[PDB]
Design a protein around this ligand. Structure first.
Ligand SMILES: O=c1ccn([C@H]2C[C@H](O)[C@@H](COP(=O)(O)NP(=O)(O)OP(=O)(O)O)O2)c(=O)[nH]1
Ligand SMILES: [Cl-]
Ligand SMILES: [Cl-]
Ligand SMILES: [Cl-]
Ligand SMILES: [Cl-]
Ligand SMILES: [Mg+2]
Ligand SMILES: [Mg+2]
Ligand code: NA
Ligand code: NA
Length: 326
DNA sequence: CCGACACCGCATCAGC
DNA sequence: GCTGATGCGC
DNA sequence: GTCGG
């Protein structure tokens, strides 16, 4: 974190634009700048120097000059003192409470943890769980704990059916020493892009994990995507581990590489790679990579047999997972 | 100047 | 119920 | 807020 000060500033700005301004593009603009600056191998000495990086424009260059000279940014100093912005930024920290619901709760006089807790009845299911585990969800997950969780998940999966293949992706697959959550990509020979020869494929797994008390709560659940809560078991007299967020994504086995590519991220890396794909005349999603015919309409899926093939299609040299943390 | 900005599953609600 | 818009987290 | 045509 050579430029931690600047990147934090940019991230706060991005959060403000998303949560308060509800200006998604400025949000992504600030996040891109923060990312490009985060990988810059030099301690930035001026805005001009920063403005040379792609994604850093004139406005951010000036803010960087202000921050470098004063150690702060007036724009953020004001934002922080604004009660409405503070309330909204706080509420959005609760899983399930987005920019809209946050501003809505503020209008109704619900702007603090105390308020949320006493108005549980005004929350949807997801928001309730998010509130319940507010503290825990803010904690990082040590890779050590991620290894224990991977062990439980893969083994429980094998017990349901030896043909399931569960791969932990997200930041974990990228080599991170700590993760915000656990993301599991699941595949089974019965479910391909050609047919679903077996229903409840995801349900079976969720069920087994709850049965052994690994999964404790459910934020949302469908045929191919599960979003919930899990907790490592603790030993006798040992204090309980914090509850953790867990995402499970069931993907057609023949589309594993596009799925593993997507679920490995980062989200910014995917945004960059997907944008570059478009510029190269292709469209990439978690299922396939297809060409972009003149009409702008996507064509038929191109053959893929490894993550590298996807990279080849867009003329990008392969990048190992640990090098996709943008 | 200015249109484009990655792409999608599940939850919830309004209209028919 | 079916469908489409919108929110929220991927 | 930034960038490409
Ligand atoms: O907007 C998004 C979010 C996530 N993703 C993909 C990439 C990301 O790595 C993966 C899992 O999402 P998480 O929110 O779990 N992020 P990640 O695992 O990278 O980091 P973290 O340690 O915070 O969970 O889903 C996107 O493509 N777009
Ligand atoms: Cl500041
Ligand atoms: Cl694939
Ligand atoms: Cl597709
Ligand atoms: Cl996902
Ligand atoms: Mg993750
Ligand atoms: Mg996740
Ligand atoms: Na730039
Ligand atoms: Na939130």
């Amino acid at each position: 974190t050579l430029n931690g000060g600047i990147t934090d500033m940019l991230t706060e700005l991005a959060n403000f634009e998303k949560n308060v301004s509800q200006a998604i593009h400025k949000y992504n603009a600030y996040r891109k700048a923060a990312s490009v600056i985060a990988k810059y191998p030099h301690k930035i000495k001026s805005g001009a120097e920063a403005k040379k990086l792609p994604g850093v424009g004139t406005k951010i260059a000036e803010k960087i000059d202000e921050f470098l000279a004063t150690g702060k940014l007036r724009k953020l100093e004001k934002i922080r003192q604004d009660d409405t912005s503070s309330s909204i930024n706080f509420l959005t920290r609760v899983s399930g409470i987005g920019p809209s619901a946050a501003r809505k709760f503020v209008d109704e006089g619900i702007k603090t943890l105390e308020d949320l807790r006493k108005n549980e009845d005004k929350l949807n299911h997801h928001q309730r769980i998010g509130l319940k585990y507010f503290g825990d969800f803010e904690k990082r997950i040590p890779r050590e704990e991620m290894l224990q969780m991977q062990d439980i998940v893969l083994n429980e999966v094998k017990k349901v059916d030896s043909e399931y293949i569960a791969t932990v992706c997200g930041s974990f697959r990228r080599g991170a020493e700590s993760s915000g959550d656990m993301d599991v990509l699941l595949t089974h020979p019965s479910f391909t892009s050609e047919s679903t020869k077996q229903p409840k494929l995801l349900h079976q797994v969720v069920e087994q994990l709850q049965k052994v008390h690994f999964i404790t709560d459910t934020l949302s659940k469908g045929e191919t995507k599960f979003m919930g809560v899990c907790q490592l078991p603790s030993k006798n007299d040992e204090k309980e581990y914090p509850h953790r967020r867990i995402d499970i994504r069931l993907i057609p086995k023949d589309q594993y590489y596009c799925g593993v590519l997507y679920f490995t991220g980062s989200d910014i890396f995917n945004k960059n790679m997907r944008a570059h794909a478009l510029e190269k005349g292709f469209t990439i999603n978690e299922y396939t990579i297809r060409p972009l015919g003149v009409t702008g309409v996507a064509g038929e899926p191109l053959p893929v047999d490894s993550e590298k093939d996807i990279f080849d299609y867009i003329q990008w040299k392969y990048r190992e997972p640990k090098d996709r943390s943008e």
